[PDB]
Amino acid sequence: PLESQYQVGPLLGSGGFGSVYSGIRVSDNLPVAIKHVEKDRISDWGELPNGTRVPMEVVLLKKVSSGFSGVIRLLDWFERPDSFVLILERPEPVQDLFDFITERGALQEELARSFFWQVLEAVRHCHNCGVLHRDIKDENILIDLNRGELKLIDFGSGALLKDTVYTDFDGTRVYSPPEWIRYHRYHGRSAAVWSLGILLYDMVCGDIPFEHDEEIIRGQVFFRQRVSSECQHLIRWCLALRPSDRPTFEEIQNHPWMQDVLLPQETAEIHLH
Ligand SMILES: Nc1ncnc2c1ncn2[C@@H]1O[C@H](COP(=O)(O)O)[C@@H](O)[C@H]1O
DSSP: OOSTTEEEEEEEEESSSOEEEEEEETTTTEEEEEEEEESTTOOOEEEOTTOOEEEHHHHHHHHHOSSOTTBOOEEEEEEETTEEEEEEEOOSSEEEHHHHHHHHOSOOHHHHHHHHHHHHHHHHHHHHTTEEOSOOSGGGEEEETTTTEEEEOOOTTOEEOOSSOBOOOOSOGGGSOHHHHHHSOBOHHHHHHHHHHHHHHHHHHSSOSOOSHHHHHHOOOOOOSOOOHHHHHHHHHHTOSSGGGSOOHHHHHTSGGGSSOOOHHHHHHHHTO
């Protein structure tokens, strides 16, 4: 009955996603995050299997909820006069990948391999559920520091997965593909693989490879840190200029650099605790 089933924590950060808040679901003292999203600022809409009009964010999240801890799970959603209030699980303690890199700098390849692997598994889950994230980047990845588990968040720029061309994009540009920049046209998976190459470079070098349109289009990768040849191969393959020259997810996960990954919990005991 009502939204009174949630005590309200402090703010965690504002942006284009909305206003997210720490929370403590009082039904069972469970830790949740409450995201408020104004009706006015939502452009993309959709509908639930039952035929109700909601923000696409809700539609996407519902499709990706299962026992798999790799995506932020949606627990509930409410509809306020001018806003959709969302209830989401909140790991604790937690820190997003952006802040983790800001503090720690470039990651050791072993760490980057565990992290990248977990993101690959999470993206695969979304796709298998018919969802395309469209904003894969370090700010949208949460790290459960106790369990060494990564979690994909903010599907507010996402879309249903399809095999035809996408000609709309409202995700992060420096992560967007050269086909989006030159033609305003892309396909789901290839574009997703491009952002993952950006994200892998980010983890192993401490920052993203391109900042300007021309650099994206030119696709020339310069390594500013020592990075193994195998890792540079994978990155450069993900950042192939022609979409068809990019690796599939299977090809990424079968790459030599991705072999012998650490399990989440091993990852934490060695690199987080
Ligand atoms: N602790 C958290 N901090 C920020 N966002 C969170 C947190 N836990 C879950 N989320 C969800 O992740 C998204 C935040 O968007 P962004 O900061 O752009 O990655 C929203 O959809 C939130 O509801």
